[PDB]
Amino acid sequence: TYKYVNLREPSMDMKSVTDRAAQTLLWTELIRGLGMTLSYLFREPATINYPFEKGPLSPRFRGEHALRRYPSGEERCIACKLCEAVCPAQAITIEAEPRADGSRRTTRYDIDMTKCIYCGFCQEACPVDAIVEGPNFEFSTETHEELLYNKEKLLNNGDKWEAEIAANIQADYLYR
Amino acid sequence: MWFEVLPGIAVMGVCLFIPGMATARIHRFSNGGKEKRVAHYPYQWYLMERDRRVSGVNRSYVSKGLENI
Amino acid sequence: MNLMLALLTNFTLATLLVIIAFWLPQLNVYSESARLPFSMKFFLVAITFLLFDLEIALLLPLPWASQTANLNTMLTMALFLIILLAVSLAYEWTQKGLEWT
Amino acid sequence: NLTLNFGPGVLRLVMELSGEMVRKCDPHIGLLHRGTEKLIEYKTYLQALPYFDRLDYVSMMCNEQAYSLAVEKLLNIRPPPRAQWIRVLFGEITRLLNHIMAVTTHALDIGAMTPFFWMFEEREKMFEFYERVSGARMHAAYVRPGGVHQDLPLGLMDDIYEFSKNFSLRIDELEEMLTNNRIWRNRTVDIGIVTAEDALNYGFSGVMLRGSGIQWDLRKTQPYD
Amino acid sequence: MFMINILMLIIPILLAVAFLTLVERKVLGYMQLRKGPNVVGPYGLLQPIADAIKLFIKEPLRPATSSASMFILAPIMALGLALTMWIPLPMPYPLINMNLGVLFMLAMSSLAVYSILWSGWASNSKYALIGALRAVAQTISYEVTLAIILLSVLLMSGSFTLSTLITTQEQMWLILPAWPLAMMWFISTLAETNRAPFDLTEGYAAGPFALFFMAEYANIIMMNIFTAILFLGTSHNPHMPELYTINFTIKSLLLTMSFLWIRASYPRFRYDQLMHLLWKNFLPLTLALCMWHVSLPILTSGIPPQT
Amino acid sequence: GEYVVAKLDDLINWARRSSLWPMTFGLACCAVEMMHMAAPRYDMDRFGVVFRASPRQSDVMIVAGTLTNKMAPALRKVYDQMPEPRYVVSMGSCANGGGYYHYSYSVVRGCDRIVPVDIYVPGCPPTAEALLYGILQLQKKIKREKRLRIWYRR
Amino acid sequence: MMLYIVFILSVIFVMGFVGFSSKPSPIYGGLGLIVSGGVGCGIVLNFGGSFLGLMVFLIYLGGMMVVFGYTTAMATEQYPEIWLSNKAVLGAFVTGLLMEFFMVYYVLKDKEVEVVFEFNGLGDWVIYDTGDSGFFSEEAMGIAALYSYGTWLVIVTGWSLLIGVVVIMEITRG
Amino acid sequence: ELLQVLKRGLQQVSGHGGLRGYLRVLFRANDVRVGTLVGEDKYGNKYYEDNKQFFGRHRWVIYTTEMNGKNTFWDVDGSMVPPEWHRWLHCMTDDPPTVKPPTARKFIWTNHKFNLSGTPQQYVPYSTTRKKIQEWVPPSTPYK
Numbered sequence A: 001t002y003k004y005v006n007l008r009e010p011s012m013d014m015k016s017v018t019d020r021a022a023q024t025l026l027w028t029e030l031i032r033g034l035g036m037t038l039s040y041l042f043r044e045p046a047t048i049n050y051p052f053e054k055g056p057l058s059p060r061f062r063g064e065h066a067l068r069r070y071p072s073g074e075e076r077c078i079a080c081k082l083c084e085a086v087c088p089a090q091a092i093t094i095e096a097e098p099r100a101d102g103s104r105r106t107t108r109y110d111i112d113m114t115k116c117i118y119c120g121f122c123q124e125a126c127p128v129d130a131i132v133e134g135p136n137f138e139f140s141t142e143t144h145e146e147l148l149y150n151k152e153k154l155l156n157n158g159d160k161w162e163a164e165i166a167a168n169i170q171a172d173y174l175y176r
Numbered sequence B: 001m002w003f004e005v006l007p008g009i010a011v012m013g014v015c016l017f018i019p020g021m022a023t024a025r026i027h028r029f030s031n032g033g034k035e036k037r038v039a040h041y042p043y044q045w046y047l048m049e050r051d052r053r054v055s056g057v058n059r060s061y062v063s064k065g066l067e068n069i
Numbered sequence C: 001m002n003l004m005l006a007l008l009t010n011f012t013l014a015t016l017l018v019i020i021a022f023w024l025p026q027l028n029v030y031s032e033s034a035r036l037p038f039s040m041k042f043f044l045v046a047i048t049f050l051l052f053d054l055e056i057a058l059l060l061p062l063p064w065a066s067q068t069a070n071l072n073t074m075l076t077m078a079l080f081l082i083i084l085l086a087v088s089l090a091y092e093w094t095q096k097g098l099e100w101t
Numbered sequence D: 001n002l003t004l005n006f007g008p009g010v011l012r013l014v015m016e017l018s019g020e021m022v023r024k025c026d027p028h029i030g031l032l033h034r035g036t037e038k039l040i041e042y043k044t045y046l047q048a049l050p051y052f053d054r055l056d057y058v059s060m061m062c063n064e065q066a067y068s069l070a071v072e073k074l075l076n077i078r079p080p081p082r083a084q085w086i087r088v089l090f091g092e093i094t095r096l097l098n099h100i101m102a103v104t105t106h107a108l109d110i111g112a113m114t115p116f117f118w119m120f121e122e123r124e125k126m127f128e129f130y131e132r133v134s135g136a137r138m139h140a141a142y143v144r145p146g147g148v149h150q151d152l153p154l155g156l157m158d159d160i161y162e163f164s165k166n167f168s169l170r171i172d173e174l175e176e177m178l179t180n181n182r183i184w185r186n187r188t189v190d191i192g193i194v195t196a197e198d199a200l201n202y203g204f205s206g207v208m209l210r211g212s213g214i215q216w217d218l219r220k221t222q223p224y225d
Numbered sequence E: 001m002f003m004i005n006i007l008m009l010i011i012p013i014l015l016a017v018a019f020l021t022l023v024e025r026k027v028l029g030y031m032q033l034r035k036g037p038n039v040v041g042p043y044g045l046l047q048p049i050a051d052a053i054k055l056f057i058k059e060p061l062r063p064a065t066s067s068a069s070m071f072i073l074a075p076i077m078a079l080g081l082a083l084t085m086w087i088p089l090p091m092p093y094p095l096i097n098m099n100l101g102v103l104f105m106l107a108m109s110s111l112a113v114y115s116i117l118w119s120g121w122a123s124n125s126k127y128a129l130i131g132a133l134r135a136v137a138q139t140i141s142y143e144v145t146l147a148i149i150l151l152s153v154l155l156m157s158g159s160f161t162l163s164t165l166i167t168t169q170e171q172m173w174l175i176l177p178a179w180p181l182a183m184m185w186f187i188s189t190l191a192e193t194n195r196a197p198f199d200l201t202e203g204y205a206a207g208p209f210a211l212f213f214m215a216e217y218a219n220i221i222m223m224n225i226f227t228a229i230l231f232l233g234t235s236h237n238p239h240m241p242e243l244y245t246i247n248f249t250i251k252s253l254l255l256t257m258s259f260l261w262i263r264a265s266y267p268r269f270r271y272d273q274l275m276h277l278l279w280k281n282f283l284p285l286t287l288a289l290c291m292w293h294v295s296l297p298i299l300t301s302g303i304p305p306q307t
Numbered sequence F: 001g002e003y004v005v006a007k008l009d010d011l012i013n014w015a016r017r018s019s020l021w022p023m024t025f026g027l028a029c030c031a032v033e034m035m036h037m038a039a040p041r042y043d044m045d046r047f048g049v050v051f052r053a054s055p056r057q058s059d060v061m062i063v064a065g066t067l068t069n070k071m072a073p074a075l076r077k078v079y080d081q082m083p084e085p086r087y088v089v090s091m092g093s094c095a096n097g098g099g100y101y102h103y104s105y106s107v108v109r110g111c112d113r114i115v116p117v118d119i120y121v122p123g124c125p126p127t128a129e130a131l132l133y134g135i136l137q138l139q140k141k142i143k144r145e146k147r148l149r150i151w152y153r154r
Numbered sequence G: 001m002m003l004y005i006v007f008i009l010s011v012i013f014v015m016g017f018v019g020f021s022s023k024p025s026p027i028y029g030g031l032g033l034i035v036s037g038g039v040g041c042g043i044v045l046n047f048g049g050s051f052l053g054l055m056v057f058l059i060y061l062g063g064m065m066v067v068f069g070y071t072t073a074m075a076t077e078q079y080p081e082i083w084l085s086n087k088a089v090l091g092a093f094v095t096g097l098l099m100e101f102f103m104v105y106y107v108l109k110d111k112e113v114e115v116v117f118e119f120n121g122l123g124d125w126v127i128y129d130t131g132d133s134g135f136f137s138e139e140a141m142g143i144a145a146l147y148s149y150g151t152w153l154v155i156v157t158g159w160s161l162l163i164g165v166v167v168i169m170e171i172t173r174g
Numbered sequence H: 001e002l003l004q005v006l007k008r009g010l011q012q013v014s015g016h017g018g019l020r021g022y023l024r025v026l027f028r029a030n031d032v033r034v035g036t037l038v039g040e041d042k043y044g045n046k047y048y049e050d051n052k053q054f055f056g057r058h059r060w061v062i063y064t065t066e067m068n069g070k071n072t073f074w075d076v077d078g079s080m081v082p083p084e085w086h087r088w089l090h091c092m093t094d095d096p097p098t099v100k101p102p103t104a105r106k107f108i109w110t111n112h113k114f115n116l117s118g119t120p121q122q123y124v125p126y127s128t129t130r131k132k133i134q135e136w137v138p139p140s141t142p143y144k
Ligand SMILES: CCCCCCCCCCCCCCCCCC(=O)OC[C@H](COP(=O)(O)OCCN)OC(=O)CCCCCCCCCCCCCCCCC
Pocket: A024, A025, A026, A027, A030, A031, D182, E180, E181, E182, E183, E184, E186, E187, E227, E231, E262, E266, E277, E281, E282, E285, E292
């Protein structure tokens, strides 16, 4: 099914021709456009007062990465390397070895945040909720090097943001 | 809101009001409290020069009435 | 003399602002006639403007001329001059002198 | 004829002009060639999906759909009906996102700048729908071979309805600025006429065909989902 | 005393131009459903000051190997002429009471096109020269109608004295007898000042750029004061002159805002299209209305006085 | 005198950060989020950041998108034309370090190989708000400058 | 002294003429003519010809010289040569100043001079009219009479302007 | 209604504690709206809401004037909002941490830090693995 967007014949009676002449000489349709911008002048603007006000986000929001713990404080990550395997950008680098107590844990967990595409595939692939994209999006830096995250930086992000991360997971985990 | 544009318009309006008010008051100050004499044509200039001589102080805006007769 | 003072002040302040604009401190210590490919159409616009401008020069005295007693002659010549401006435009128009294609 | 190398997406145009008239137009592209097609050969099928968000990066989920449909065809599987309805729903939200971008930046380019601002607040509200289903405002990676990644959060359809209820009024305001404006018409009417036969032979598609009277739309003739 | 008077005109002109940059940004903002400057000072009141300081302490680049004599002469002429256009304006009294004031403004503005011509030469770039030559053609073309429209209006006024326009409009604004002329005058001032939808140049740096920008916006305010005087004459009470200044200032502000209102509302003409607007629409009508306004006072017996 | 220099430094710093005119190199998808920062919700112009500026009038360059090898000389030419002081904001993973295309034959692995960078905004793309955070971070960096203080201790 | 304003302007008038008459690059030859035009208007203004003075600004400078510069930027020079670079230009320029300076120096000393012909150096004010008091501008009344007395002048002038349009279009068609 | 509009404008001066308090928020936040105080965090940031504002402007924060020894009277940052309020302020949830507190964990930071880039506290990356190959150390005694 289709419709025509511009298949019409102007009427050629005197009243119609004189209507179009007046539009030509009195600029009536231009004056009409002025009316619409005038109406916007008296509308309340949509601007929010950043940084005192923030744009709304959802619990699914994909922001800065963090490494998480169990309630005991033990690391969740068990160096399975599923995140590294799935990462579309090859932004994750992992090394692991038996910990002094025999635990399977990483000795390296790096995320190049300038390779990362913030796709969230790592947190989908993780079987233990160890790596997540947190809610923080305000972490711009003055140097390139500051965006090469190692395990210490990522654990500190987990400890810094866990209060919010856990609540967001609580809201969305039944959708996963 | 739209009325937050008014402060900028008020500043501009005061800037445009000053030149007109300044010239009007400066003219009164320099012309004995009257309007500046307008002399577009030689007849009006001849009268203004005659005013300067008649004034006795060489100011066309000092005026002499019947007190001088 | 007033007009000279106003003119001298206007262009003197303009000069001062431009030279100051160039000579502010920088805080640095280290080292720092053919035929233009332009259409004939633009030449004809400038020439067309010039000839219409000369016609406007002749029409400028019209407010004073309307005070004449010989109004029949004055009105006839005023309309004669403007009509000839109209004919000039029509000649440019019909000869494609106002086209850009 | 005067020759000009215009331009520094980013476009380089080498144009031969004769006075005011364009004698030749030679677009020089590749300023945004990023070897996507080669990089995809080193990815699994899932890993390649986010590359499709970044092609027509105004129609993200429509690009995902095309790739997913291709993979599902090769897999010989089909997505479940609810995933298909979500994909059509967000495919049409994506069309609004694209068309707002197309019309208003088309208008902004020729000096009609205000409608861009009005309609990009509408775009910002649809970016919220993207973020609420996927956590990203643009590169959702939400439509995948086999369906979608997650179900809609509770309460989203209510907000899409609320957005849609008022949107046709926004279109009307855009039309008040452009549709009958004589300046807009002088800039657009009889510009770039393409015949039906030229359009088909040059490989045009979409509105580039329908603008010339050709009755073709793949959603009608070769429907999907 | 008179030196005080000169400075009491020049300095407010520059401050008014500076704060027009704020008003334009905010008016355009709210028409675009946003706010515009509201952080730098309360309600953006310090934004013009920040912009001006930023521009003057910016590196003042030059084209190099240019007619730098005319790189510096272009903005000096532009700003000097722009400030000169204000000295005969009656508000209600002019700084200089010129018998031929209306013709003095015509003469001075016709020179303003030189700063465009010189700046194109001074760029050393052949494509910048072409753009300058396109702007000159647009400017001189719309000079033609502005002069003929002005002459038509002065046939109801009877003199070239700007303050006589005040006398002519004691009973009624000239916009009523001459709204067709006022429509074309207003559009001509837009195309004359290269304003949208005639801003084809937008289709210098640091302080030199600021001086070109200030000269342009001085002319924009100037042309809108002239429009208010020419067509919306304010009644002048000799014993309360500031009543004139208030009312005439408001009219000038509203007309200047309408320049910003129009910029927010329309697309941009093509070059050939705004040339056809002048040569094939405005000029034919302007010539016909000039004939009509030459005949009209004679056939109604409403010829104005000379003096 | 140190009190006068400190105040003069504060004045010029305030003017330069209160009047940042950006030249946007809208190379790819990150340009769209830059558009949304100019759009009504965030209105960058309300901070004194005009929507669009010509290179010769711009104070900050925003590299918003992938920088390919073909494009790199053009970008460096525009940077060399900017009057000083000039700053560069690198927006998004592509500009920051190559991002998704880091291993491609045709892509510059980070625009900081071509121009000095002042601020790196992470994200693919960064949200409009995240970019605005970066601009406000650039302003604070300018607020820290002590050009006149260092000049008078030379 | 202000009593020699006309003489001072006429000195600048002549210096402007030596400027472009020595013929530097056309761009700077135009500027010298522009400066001469403005000074020439000043000379005319001081003899009571306000309208004639302004016509020089509006038609000569605002009209003809704009087209001269506009055409120069197209069909002639887009880039000037450094002013006074050529010896012929400099030698001609120096000679004109040397001739003018001696005329001024002698005329200002003896209040008279005999460069070919005899001139009085007392000041141009001595010859001015002494008794004026009309309620109008005599110059304006003379120019306005173009429409009352100059019917013939209007016809032949208006016809020449029309032919100018026709002729120039013929010339430039090629 | 213009009198009601002006009365409301006056009520903002009193709603902020007088002229001084009205001017402080005007210059610190470029906003003089009066909302309902939802709560205050341990760093001094104050959180307000007004549900009659349109979505996006219905919640805001007035940042503390000092946080972790940094003067923030004029230098406010979006990263000063601590995680527990971050969720509320960005509308990821409806309930503020005064109503639904976050779960306590021993390892969670007791003190939030804002963006530390550009300062001596900035992160510097480094390899977290130990040396892989051990080189032979020659004997310390002589015997060639
Ligand atoms: C009793 C006997 C009396 C005798 C006298 C009678 C005379 C009255 C009847 C004649 C009235 C004529 C009105 C004159 C106005 C100019 C008319 C005109 O030229 O408009 C047409 C012009 C071109 O028309 P277009 O559609 O583009 O193409 C037609 C060519 N095929 O299109 C345009 O010019 C449009 C303008 C483009 C710019 C748009 C931006 C301006 C829009 C806002 C305008 C606001 C109004 C101005 C108010 C000014 C106040 C000072």
